[PDB]
């Protein structure tokens, strides 16, 4: 179908984070059989292979932003690849990685479909600017490089000179926020970004949360959706092997429901599975659980419904 016509892009990149290890995100997400599982449902999966990220040996912090040139060039490469897989009419399934790659994954996707609406599922806002950041990491600042409303509040970071901010403030919906810094929250409330923090999810139920999300994005006009999932968005009992797990988050069922409701719109046009960190699993079972949850989320984005799926044939024969 026009949906579930996947183009998979590896992104074994971790330099946008503190001392990392998420670069073996694609390796585990694939060795857990993601392509082999996406082919049972009628998906035209094309593996564009793990991106070769050229090395930046001498790459010094900008002011506090750790290793900005590496992240900037990695995201430019990813954006080029994502534009390549979107010109083929596919769904750019960028499985990474860290959100420092979301800058590329959305900037490339917006080169083709300028009017995409982003659904950001993350425990964090990931909206620090290079000025208001505190840890000086770039996994925590991918949205600030994308919002049109933050132009002028984003310094000319080295390596991010190619970034033209693409999404408006009114084209992004946060789901699952439960760990927001004061600067992130000031930016979030000033720009009028629609967000469904954990409190709004508890108040409304995930069903009403997703109904409002889709009526807010796809209400005025049907547009592509770029679900930029982050596995720390789900509760740590389900995804323990992630960078910064925050307790009391979306359950497994709620994550699956988010993805199923996004799929059923049929407008999904890009997906990111970020922050799978198999090095932070206390036990190999924790890594297996995180990877299985990420795989289940990914599959549900592409038609695998919990009620069960059947091919359009007469099974009573």
């Amino acid at each position, epitope marked *: 179908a026009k949906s579930r016509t996947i183009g998979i892009i590896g992104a074994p990149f971790s330099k946008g984070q503190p001392r990392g*290890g998420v670069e073996e995100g694609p390796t585990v997400l694939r060795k857990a059989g993601l392509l082999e599982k996406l082919k049972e449902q009628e998906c035209d999966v094309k593996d564009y292979g793990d991106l070769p990220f050229a090395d930046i040996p001498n790459d010094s912090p900008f002011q506090i932003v750790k290793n900005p040139r590496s992240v900037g060039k990695a995201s430019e490469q990813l954006a080029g690849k994502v534009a390549e897989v979107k010109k083929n009419g596919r769904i750019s399934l960028v499985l990474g990685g860290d959100h420092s790659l979301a800058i590329g994954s959305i900037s490339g996707h917006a080169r083709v479909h300028p009017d995409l609406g982003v659904i950001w599922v993350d425990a964090h806002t990931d909206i620090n600017t290079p000025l208001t950041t505190t840890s000086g990491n770039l996994h925590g600042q991918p949205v600030s490089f994308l919002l049109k409303e933050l132009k002028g509040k984003i310094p000319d970071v080295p390596g991010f000179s190619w970034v033209t901010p693409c999404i408006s403030a009114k084209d992004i919906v946060y789901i699952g926020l439960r760990d927001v810094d004061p600067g992130e929250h000031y930016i979030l409330k000033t720009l009028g970004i629609k967000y469904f923090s954990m409190t709004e999810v508890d108040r409304l139920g995930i069903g009403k949360v997703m109904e409002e999300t889709l009526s807010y994005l796809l209400g005025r006009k049907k547009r592509p959706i770029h679900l930029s999932f982050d596995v720390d968005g789900l509760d740590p009992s389900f995804t323990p092997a992630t960078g910064t797990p925050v307790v009391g988050g979306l359950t497994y069922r709620e994550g699956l429901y988010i993805t199923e409701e996004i799929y059923k719109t049929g407008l999904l046009s890009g997906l990111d599975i970020m922050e799978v960190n198999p090095s932070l699993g206390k036990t190999p079972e924790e890594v297996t659980r995180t990877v299985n949850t990420a795989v289940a989320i990914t599959l549900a984005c592409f038609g695998l419904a919990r009620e069960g799926n059947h091919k359009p044939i007469d099974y009573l024969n």
Partner: antibody, heavy 123, light 108 residues
């Protein structure tokens, strides 16, 4: 000042076992990604295996895959490497090397090295 | 795996004339190649970080280059205090296998 002092065995005749060590000092240990390389005397080097700032992405060369294991103790600054079922071709001088930069981000070269622990395996 | 092959398994050019070691790899490693120098009886010091990168303190003679599958390491002038064995790291996720080496020497 960035000494990688190596310790451990050096004489095991049978297919026995050893556990080397590399008492690192000078740098923040739980930040860099330490590795182990071997060098048979007068021969080329060979990457034995490597680990993270944490321990958990231990990758091994496809010659010691099922035999060696690296542990690491960030609170105590060591680089234990457990060798098991020595195949007597592992008669090399084993170096511990650092990661050349901060993050243990996977791909990194080897800047600072220890030297020694001449493991011989011998009857 | 990825097999790394130093092209000259040993060479001896001159005090003077340039020297070019090649490290054609097996599958594209794409700018993850470190060139070392051992000076036998000591510890290998690193020379070149990502295929050029001229690590600090290394004399500007070494001008390694290349990307993708095959690379080089062009010593502009040999200057016999550079007589040593040079390696080829291939540092990415974790094959990280070196090369055979390259005995470099002079004549008399």
């Amino acid at each position: 000042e960035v000494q990688l002092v190596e310790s451990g065995g050096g004489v095991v005749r049978p297919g026995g076992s050893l556990r080397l060590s590399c008492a690192a000092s000078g740098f923040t240990f739980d930040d860099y990604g330490m590795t182990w390389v071997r060098q048979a005397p007068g021969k080329g080097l060979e990457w034995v295996s490597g680990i993270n700032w944490n321990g958990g992405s231990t990758g091994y060369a496809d010659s010691v895959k099922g035999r060696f294991t690296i542990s690491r103790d960030n609170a105590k600054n060591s680089l234990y490497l457990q060798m098991n079922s020595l195949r007597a071709e592992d008669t090399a001088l084993y170096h511990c090397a650092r990661d050349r930069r901060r993050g243990s981000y996977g791909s990194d070269a080897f800047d600072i090295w220890g030297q020694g622990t001449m493991v011989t395996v011998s009857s | 795996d990825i097999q790394m092959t130093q092209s000259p398994s040993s060479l001896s050019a001159s005090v003077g004339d340039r020297v070019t070691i090649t490290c054609r790899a097996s599958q594209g490693i794409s700018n993850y190649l470190a060139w070392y120098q051992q000076k036998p009886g000591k510890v290998p010091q690193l020379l070149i970080s990502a295929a050029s990168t001229l690590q600090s303190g290394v004399p500007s003679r070494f001008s390694g280059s290349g990307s993708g599958t095959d690379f080089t390491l062009t010593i502009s002038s040999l200057q016999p205090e550079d007589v040593a064995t040079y390696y080829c790291q291939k540092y990415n996720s974790a094959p990280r296998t070196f090369g055979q080496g390259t005995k470099v020497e002079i004549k008399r």
